[PDB]
Copies of this chain bind each other. A is one copy, B any other.
Amino acid sequence: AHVAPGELDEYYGFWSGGHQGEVRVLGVPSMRELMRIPVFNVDSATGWGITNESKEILGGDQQYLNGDCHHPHISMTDGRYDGKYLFINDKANTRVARIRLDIMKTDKITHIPNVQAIHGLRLQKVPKTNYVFCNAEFVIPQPNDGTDFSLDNSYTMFTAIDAETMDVAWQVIVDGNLDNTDADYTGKYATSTCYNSERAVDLAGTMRNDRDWVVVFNVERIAAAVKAGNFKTIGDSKVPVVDGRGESEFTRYIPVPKNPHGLNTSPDGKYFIANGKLSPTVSVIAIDKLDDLFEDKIELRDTIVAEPELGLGPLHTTFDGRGNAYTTLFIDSQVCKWNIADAIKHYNGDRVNYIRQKLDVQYQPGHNHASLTESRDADGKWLVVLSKFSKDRFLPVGPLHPENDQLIDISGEEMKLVHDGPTYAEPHDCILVRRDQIKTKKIYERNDPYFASCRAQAEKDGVTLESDNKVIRDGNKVRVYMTSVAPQYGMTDFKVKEGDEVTVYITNLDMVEDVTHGFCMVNHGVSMEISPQQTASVTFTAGKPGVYWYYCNWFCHALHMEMVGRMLVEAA
């Protein structure tokens, strides 16, 4: 539970950043932040959102200075974390991102078409992560061209993204909306909760029905239908779309108690658990009974194997791999450990007690996460509870309070609070992985994708990134290529004309671990990272004529303050 100087943490903790936009890498159990991976935010340090490389990844036809990421998930191979990728959603601007875990950098960014607010997101587990499943939370007209604002004709869709290409594979139109989602351990099924079957906007209308549902998607059927060419296209997108509304061979709507929120798959792979929220219950769906349900051999609610009452406001559930479940109670402000088997029995008529313990969590719990819970290897050692209010938990810091993610020891019979972790800009879910499930690199290979465009442009200009220090003029454009080692840039002076579009390419020749350099052009709003053997580039417009210094902003040597240069801008 304690990590001293010189010792290392056992698990990596990938924390969603919420509406702050980044992904935070913490070490567990110390609970310290080890790194920040910019994603939908603009990082002033590494220059993510500023550098050309990052802007090419972000794409889009408009620059977004924000994002809202909630659900980080790691790629899998046969129900086990393989550590290659980490995917996460953007509810603010309808995007999904992919992070390269070998270097901890956003790799791909995709815009989901004809849909709005990507919220729920999870990956396929078996045979491996071929599909990234995403939920669009808000219903809108199809197409959303402004010719019909009515909620009557507003719908949302379920989106499947090809994990290796990050291109959308297909979308499934559904009824109501989509909140959270999860997949099984076969690859055939995926499911999502719904809280707005009423497709209303006002509160009163979204709480109307006593029950909403859990939509089950038959990925096998859906994929077949798309392969056979039986699909349509919406708007200007070419993405294959299938209809999963009403009586469809692609979907099954299992009614669930009021505005269900979380939806979690158990490690054993036989239960999809929907969280009640408005209903003080949880709904346990049997994945084993799904085949018959899609064959109309049984009734919709026959898939329900249990629906135990736990407390007020259940939002998310996680598992210890020992048959117990842990659910957060928002309103009662606590986490509840209960036995699934006992819940199955109690549901059938028994009197067995299924609730084993209730631990008071410090102010309104949201997501819940137990180590390796999303894999066959759920070890039941650690449980993280991410609360939404910190009230008096930490020193006062103004009207804006931090969130409080508490580390709880669940390796034993009883839950024991171990650490109170203050956090910024509301994280939602998080995922822990064993130190050995990730294979990190320390220095870049010169053919790395993260700067393939840089050498492509270099080849055209006839420059050798690893040794040249040239200035190339191309009309109003000016490309400057520099090299960096020790406390010096391969170039300490260059001239351009006011208004010129200047691009600077910095290639870091140092090969010693942790010897990172930076580049910052004064009064030009430019900054970027250049770790060992990397090439990064940033373009800006030269300001009014005069002298503008540039310097390394990454302390790299005793002569760091001196790692400088001057850009001379003359009247055009």
Interface residues of A (CB under 8 A from B): 5-6, 8-9, 12, 18-21, 25, 27, 31-36, 40-47, 49-50, 62-68, 91-94, 102-105, 116-117, 137-138, 140-141, 143-147, 149, 154, 179, 195-196, 201-203, 206-207, 259, 261, 277-278, 313, 330-331, 362-364, 366, 388-391, 393-402, 406, 417-426, 435, 438, 440-444, 487-488, 492-493, 498, 513-516, 518, 520, 522-527, 529, 531-534, 544-549, 551, 553-556, 558-559, 561-562, 564-566, 568-571
Contacts and interface: CB of A to CB of B under 8 A. Distances in A.
Nearest to A534: B399
Contacts of A64: 525
Given A32-B394, A34-B397, A36-B425, 10 more contacts: A9-B394, A19-B45, A27-B395, A66-B525, A92-B523, A94-B523, A141-B547, A147-B545, A366-B555, A426-B554
A520 B420 contact: no
A206 B562 contact: yes
Contacts of A389: 514-515
Contacts of A492: 201-202
Given A19-B518, A68-B527, A514-B391, A27 B399 contact: no
B65 A45 contact: no
B395 A435 contact: yes
B488 A9 contact: no
A146 B499 CA distance: 13
Nearest to A36: B424
Given A68-B527, A195-B561, A529-B400, A45 B391 contact: no
A419 B31 CA distance: 13
A33 B400 contact: no
Contacts of A117: 522, 549, 551
A104 B561 contact: no
A525 to B, nearest CB: 4
Nearest to A154: B547
Nearest to A552: B19
9 A-B pairs with the lowest CB-CB distances in the bound complex, closest first: A146-B545, A45-B425, A144-B546, A399-B531, A44-B66, A104-B398, A21-B44, A388-B555, A396-B440
Q: How many of these chains are in the complex?
A: 2
A568 B179 CA distance: 23
A444 B398 CA distance: 9
Kindly name the residue among A9, A393, A522 whose own CB sees the greatest number of chain B CB atoms within 10 A.
A522
A5 B420 contact: yes
A66 B259 contact: no
A566 B199 CA distance: 13
A40 B523 CA distance: 12
A393 to B, nearest CB: 8
A562 B401 CA distance: 22
A38 to B, nearest CB: 10
Label chain A's interface by main secondary structure.
Answer: loop
A198 to B, nearest CB: 11
B553 A92 contact: yes
Q: Which of A42, A102, A394, A395 has the most B CB atoms < 10 Å from its CB?
A: A395
A5 B566 CA distance: 52
A561 to B, nearest CB: 6
Given A140-B547, A261-B561, A561-B261, A399 B553 contact: no
Query: Which of A25, A438, A523, A534 counts the most chain B CB atoms within 10 A?
Result: A523
Contacts of A531: 399-400
A485 to B, nearest CB: 12
Given A93-B523, A203-B487, A549-B116, A441 B398 contact: yes
Given A141-B547, A425-B45, A63 B525 contact: yes
A546 B5 contact: no
Nearest to A103: B398
B41 A397 contact: no
Contacts of A424: 33, 35-36, 45
Candidate in A140, A400, A438, A559 with the most chain B CB atoms within 10 angstroms? A400
Contact of A19 (B44, B140, B406): B44
B522 A93 contact: yes
B201 A395 contact: no
Contact of A62 (B91, B525, B547): B525
B43 A425 contact: yes
23 contacts: A5-B406, A9-B394, A20-B43, A27-B394, A32-B394, A33-B33, A35-B402, A45-B426, A47-B66, A50-B66, A64-B525, A93-B523, A144-B547, A146-B544, A154-B547, A196-B562, A201-B565, A203-B559, A203-B562, A261-B561, A277-B558, A389-B514, A399-B532
A46 B401 CA distance: 12
Contact of A44 (B20, B179, B513): B20
A547 B45 contact: no
